[PDB]
Design a protein around this ligand. Structure first.
Ligand SMILES: C[C@H]1CCC[C@H](C[C@H]2Cc3cc(O)cc(O)c3C(=O)O2)O1
Lengths: 171, 31, 31
């Protein structure tokens, strides 16, 4: 158990190092909003005494980050808690931690390259190799080695779905 | 001088090919 | 001074992450 939380800490520290070295500014944006945004989710509601109004716990920092880019801060990131008032299951908790970053003058192609580099690099640094064993159904089920060796496979949603369905979708 | 014939590249402007590119970097503020 | 505890990053060397990269260029010999 200790070892899992050490790994978790190493993941976060790795990401900060990666983003810092690329010139990103670590920022903190409001966790309480007049209007929650930046994602699709049910928000938490609370009452603020000083302003005598209800506020919503953030579901994502996205809109604040983009306003700061407008502000002229070209590269920003935030690793912090988000709150979504939905279901609890094996991959969902109402409060969870995310990293978001925003990069002026980049497009999605750039971010795929950066994502491959960060994630593969992280996995190799932390585990010693690109291949990780995982039990998707727990120790009573089968395990699989997951290969983080870059580049990652790419598929186009509509294209691949149409192929898997054996039919064309309406535009 | 022999009569003028425009170059086959059109004559508008010198060929300017699209070249490979590399996302610029900003320095670590902490460094 | 409180007793020594090695950092969780191992203590060997400062974290050195793999960063994105860009193939270098040589100049046009004709330019
Ligand atoms: C910011 C997003 C980007 C995509 C991955 C991940 C999705 C996120 C969704 C999500 C929703 C939710 O209600 C509770 C949760 O624990 C998660 C989660 O851990 O993963 O983080």
């Amino acid at each position: 158990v200790r070892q899992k939380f050490i790994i978790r800490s190493k993941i976060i520290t790795y990401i900060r190092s990666f983003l810092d070295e690329l010139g990103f500014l670590e920022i903190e944006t409001p966790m309480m909003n007049i209007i929650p945004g930046g994602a699709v989710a049910k928000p938490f509601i609370t009452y603020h005494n000083e302003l005598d109004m209800n506020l919503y716990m953030r579901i994502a920092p996205e809109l604040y980050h983009k306003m700061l880019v407008v502000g002229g801060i070209d590269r920003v990131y935030e690793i912090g808690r988000q709150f979504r008032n939905e279901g609890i299951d094996l991959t969902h908790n109402p409060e969870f931690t995310t990293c978001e970053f925003y990069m002026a003058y980049a497009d999605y192609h750039d971010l795929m390259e950066i994502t491959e580099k960060m994630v593969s690099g992280m996995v190799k640094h932390i585990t010693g190799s690109y291949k990780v064993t995982y039990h998707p159904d727990g120790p009573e089920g089968q395990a699989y080695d997951v290969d983080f060796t870059p580049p990652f496979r790419r598929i186009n949603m509509v294209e691949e779905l149409e192929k898997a369905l054996g039919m064309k979708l309406p535009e | 001088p022999m009569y003028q014939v425009k170059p086959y590249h059109g004559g508008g402007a010198p060929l300017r090919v699209e070249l490979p590119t590399c996302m610029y970097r900003l320095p670590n503020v902490h460094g």
